[PDB]
A = this chain, B = another copy of it.
Amino acid sequence: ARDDPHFNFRMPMEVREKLKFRAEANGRSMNSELLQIVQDALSKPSPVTGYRNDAERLADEQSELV
């Protein structure tokens, strides 16, 4: 669609229990929690801000593991 695209995620049993618990366990609803952890995971700050860190690791261990 090229402005808000759909794709199938679509995940092995423990990732979609871990990502959907992280949602239903904690308080986001995975198109919510997947987005707020994913916009978290590779775009980082909601403004507190005592936040500089290895989320520079899901960086260099997804992408120097790869």
**Are B6 and A18 in contact, with the CB atoms below 8 A?**
no
In the bound complex, what is the Cα–Cα distance between A62 and B63 (angstroms)? Answer: 24
A36 contacts B64, C-beta separation under 8 Å: yes
Q: Which of chain B's residues has its CB closest to A63's CB?
A: B46
Instruction: List residues 1-42 of chain A with CB under 8 A from any CB of chain B.
Output: 2-16, 18-19, 22, 26-28, 30-31, 33-42
Is the CB–CB distance between A2 and B13 below 8 Å?
yes
| A60 and B38 contacting across the interface, CB-CB below 8 Å | no
Cβ contact within 8 Å between B22 and A4: no
> Measuring CB to CB, which residues of chain A are less than 8 angstroms from any residue of chain B?
2-16, 18-19, 22, 26-28, 30-31, 33-46, 48, 50-66
